[PDB]
Design a protein that fits this description.
Layout lengths: L1 H12 L9 H6 L4 H12 L3 H19 L4 H7 L5 H12 L3 H5 L14
Helix pairs in contact: 5-6
The structure holds a DNA duplex (24 and 24 nucleotides).
Length: 116
DNA sequence: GGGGATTTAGCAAAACGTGGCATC
DNA sequence: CCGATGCCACGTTTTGCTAAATCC
């Protein structure tokens, strides 16, 4: 798995940025969703679902601070059906909505997950 | 007193995460 | 028999909808 799981990882980072990268779409590449999940968990100790999301939340967080792309545009661009949906997911992952997170200095790298 | 941008609400519906099992 | 796999059941979580607050 190390070899194939280590690959699905690149394909993911080579995606989130727009895809809905759901377990199914992620399934396509490789085996059955349940299996890919089995391998990847045992391989990374990280559930596929929460890792992808952790990666999208960490990436949306860096753009809110390194750029001015409107959060609706960020919502649509990372696969969210709306601002409200992203607003609640962001809030749930950071405990601070997107705009408020955008306008605060002290708020740091806290909770960021990186590429693997 | 209005208006757009943000944030929250609340419940059902769909997706996850996983262990036990049938299969390849 | 073994082990990599697909699968289903099912407790948890997240999203889909729909409105509505709050902010500025």
């Amino acid at each position: 798995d190390a070899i194939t799981i280590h690959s699905i990882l690149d394909w993911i980072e080579d995606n989130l940025e727009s895809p809905l990268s759901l377990e199914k779409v992620s399934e396509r590449s490789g085996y059955s969703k349940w299996h890919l999940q089995r391998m990847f968990k045992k391989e990374t100790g990280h559930s596929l679902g929460q890792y992808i999301r952790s990666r999208k939340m960490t990436e949306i967080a860096q753009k809110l601070k390194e750029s001015n792309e409107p959060i609706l545009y960020l919502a649509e661009r990372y696969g969210f059906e709306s601002q409200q949906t992203l607003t609640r997911t962001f809030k749930n992952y950071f405990d601070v909505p997107p705009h408020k997170y955008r306008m605060t200095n002290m708020q740091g790298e806290s909770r960021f997950l990186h590429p693997l």
